[PDB]
Design a protein around this nucleic acid. Structure first.
Lengths: 72, 107, 52, 90, 99
RNA sequence: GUGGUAGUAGCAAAUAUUCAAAUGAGAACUUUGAAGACUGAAGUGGAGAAGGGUUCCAUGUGAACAGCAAUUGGACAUGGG
RNA sequence: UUCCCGAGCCAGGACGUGGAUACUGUACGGUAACGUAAGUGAACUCCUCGACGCAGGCAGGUGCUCCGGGAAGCGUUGUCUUUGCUUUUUAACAGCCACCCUGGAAUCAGUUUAGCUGGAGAUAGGGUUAGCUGGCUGGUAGAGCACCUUGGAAGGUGUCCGGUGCGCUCCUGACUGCCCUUGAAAAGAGGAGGGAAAGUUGUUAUUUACACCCCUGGCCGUACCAAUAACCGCAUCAGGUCUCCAAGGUUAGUAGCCUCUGGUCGAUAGAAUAAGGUAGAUAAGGGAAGUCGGCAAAAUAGAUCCGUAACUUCGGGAAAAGGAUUGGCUCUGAGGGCUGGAACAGCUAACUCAGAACUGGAGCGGACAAGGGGAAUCCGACUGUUUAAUUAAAACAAAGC
């Protein structure tokens, strides 16, 4: 449901311990991408347009966090 | 072409059973029961509607924060404000005229 | 317009131009009388100062 | 244009009920659909909300009155005579 | 104005010898209308082939309109049952068979 | 309980069926296709209430019932929902 | 809407970490209308919502219907056809996009389709607030939909961009009118006035909807018919039985007539075509001579333009009576909107009237639909009501007296 608009909040909501998974969506138009954290009440999501920033961001997610899912 | 059926238990055309044609991700056209249109708080003794404070059905007035259900003033939740000026200009003068007599009543 | 008078947009526009271009020919007449009734006083007051 | 000769507000009731009865209605129907002057604000915007009740539209005040006019003449006589009876009592 | 070069390859037909791909070039030269005109091809339209596969170049034109005219051809040769026109990509058709 | 009447009155409103193949002991009437019609969105369409109460769904079938027929069925039987 | 996958919300009760506020006593900002992540409020009292008529048009919105471009597949092809048809969708939920100040109005001004508004402060300039089923992002393409290719179920592309309206549907909004008619209650939720209580710089105490986190949600109904075969009429009976949604063409039209989606062909058949029936058509000349009686059937019918009496309670009579025109095709004229500053220059969108030419077996509201009229008498004034299954009237009622 809810969005996030900046990288300050997205790093907090991932690290918060009841966050289950991070499904990550990519789509061609060009390569605009979405992260979505399924937390407990809400599904938070964070739009990024540049692919090279989004490749850097996937490293910044923690490994001890469980899942990741991708179309493709 | 496509024609629809009531989804809830009430299949009659009352106030409560007001409905709204939507179309879905199915490309399927379908009702939703939206309720009655809430009257926003007309408040006395003028009976004008109050600015600051929204039309909701009165149980959902619980959900809102306390901030949202009022105006921050004296008699803010239920007063016209313009009406409020009347209250003060009464109670200032009706004390002052009453006081002026009771100093004159010393003689 | 609320009465009836004008049946098209064109007739209303044609009416406004007729009834404006009176008031230009009015203001040609009105400006000179305001100039001349000032100059009736201005010729008088230049004379009436020269009395004393 | 004036668009009837005589019947006026009671063209409404058409070609029935009978002309004597229709005229009784005409004269007091003409009264009740009138605006009257408000006592309190001044503005002539008083309308009859219900029989015996009148509201000043501009003012917002409601007041009691006649069925079909703001001030019945009998009631105007009592407002005179009670003002007199209060004065002589002192 | 820009330009679009499409294609209709007849390759799976022609190697059975059933289409003549010379005939479809001269058909599209004649039958294409420009501004509601026929045989009035100049400078907007440019039709020219490898012979393995025919190209059509246009200025306002519709991908659809090539598939209309190839269906017109295949009826005249009595080959409608044998093959149908299908989009391989944008800017392309391929001819195929039924199963 | 049984006749004559009598194999008689009659089965004629709501425009309408036809051709092929399959199934079967048996096909004007079941199913599937192809044609041709009707209903003509204040529909013979899609959903509720009252009333009904398992008629719903599947598989099976010797009667009787479905005013001709019947391989079909709101019928009959055994399951399920 | 109950199963599953996904996305939420509500009632009751709550731990925890991290933020706000106060600690001689409950946050601040704005001139204001009121505002923001939070911002204590006992007894008692007052107020709001719950909470309400009908008709009328007007504006805006959802859904439907419609026109055009783009991309897919499909259909037609002796002839023509840049062509005709189908698909091109986005949920609840969640975030963001009347009133105040300045001012002081007559040469009165603002304004609606309609009227209303204004020194009890108008126009104007700048604000605040209400809102819908409005716009953008999240939900959300992974789904749904339309197609294509390899297996003998695996993998792909595409799902785009705009208009139009006295249109049809339901909803909202503010108005206007009508009444000797003025159009429910209670549960429940909230506000305010009041200031009872607590709190002394730390395990404090107000926040249980400040943000996030945590736990629980009992009982019963839920199949199917809802009617020319599942109900009631003894029956699979031409009867009856409350509600919702409601496409295209013709047209004023939910009239009649034909069609798309959805549904159906269920109603014993075949052969002959006598009289007599049942329903349906048509008849030379005459035109009510038939008959108790014009009963039945004919004739009239739409729209436009012209014209319209006696009598009258002056409202009516009146569609009185009485006439003329209408098709097709090709044109002409009148009627809007948006852009840059004497009115010009560009771009452009409606179905509505008026008129002319030509053409035809003098037809044209070409089917459907659709008043016969006039002159008098009796009764009842009128609308309304009545003997369910032989009587709808002059009977009942009615306002007036």
């Amino acid at each position: 449901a809810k969005e996030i608009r900046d990288l300050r909040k997205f790093l907090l909501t991932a690290r918060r311990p009841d966050a289950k998974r991070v499904t990550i969506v990519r789509q061609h138009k060009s390569t605009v991408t979405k992260f979505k954290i399924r937390c407990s009440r809400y599904l938070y999501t964070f739009v990024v347009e540049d692919r090279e920033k989004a490749q850097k961001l996937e490293g910044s997610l923690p490994p001890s966090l469980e899942k990741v899912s991708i179309p493709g | 072409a496509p024609r629809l059926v009531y989804r809830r238990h009430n299949h009659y055309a009352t106030g409560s059973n007001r409905v709204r044609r939507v179309r879905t991700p199915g490309a399927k056209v379908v009702f939703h029961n939206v309720g009655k249109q809430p009257s926003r708080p007309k408040c006395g003794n003028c009976h004008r509607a109050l600015p600051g404070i929204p039309a909701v059905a009165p149980h959902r007035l619980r959900l809102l924060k306390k901030r949202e259900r009022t105006v921050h003033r004296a008699y803010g939740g239920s007063r016209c404000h313009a009406c409020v000026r009347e209250r003060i200009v009464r109670a200032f003068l009706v004390e002052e005229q009453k006081c002026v007599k009771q100093v004159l009543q010393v003689k | 317009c609320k009465g009836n008078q004008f049946k098209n947009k064109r007739v209303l526009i044609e009416a406004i131009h007729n009834e404006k271009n009176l008031k230009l020919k009015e203001k040609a007449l009105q400006e000179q009388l305001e100039a001349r009734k000032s100059k009736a006083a201005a010729q008088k007051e230049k004379r009436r100062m020269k009395e004393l | 244009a004036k668009r009837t000769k005589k019947v006026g507000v009671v063209g409404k009731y058409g070609t029935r009920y009978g002309a004597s009865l229709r005229k009784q209605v005409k004269k007091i129907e003409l009264q009740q659909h009138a605006k009257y002057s408000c006592p309190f604000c001044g503005k002539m915007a008083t309308k009859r909300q219900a029989v015996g009740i009148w509201k000043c539209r501009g003012c917002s005040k409601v007041m009691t009155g006649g069925a079909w006019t703001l001030q019945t003449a009998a009631a105007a006589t009592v407002r005179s005579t009670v003002a007199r009876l209060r004065k002589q009592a002192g | 104005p820009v330009k679009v070069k499409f294609t209709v390859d007849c390759q799976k037909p022609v190697d059975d010898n059933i289409i003549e791909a010379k005939g479809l070039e001269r058909f599209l030269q004649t039958h294409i209308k420009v501004d509601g005109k026929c045989n009035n091809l100049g400078d907007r339209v440019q039709v020219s082939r490898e012979k393995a596969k025919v190209f059509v170049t246009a200025e306002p034109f519709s991908k659809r309109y090539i598939k209309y005219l190839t269906k017109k051809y295949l009826k005249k040769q009595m080959l409608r049952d044998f093959m149908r026109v299908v989009s391989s990509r944008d800017t392309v058709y391929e001819l195929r068979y039924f199963q």
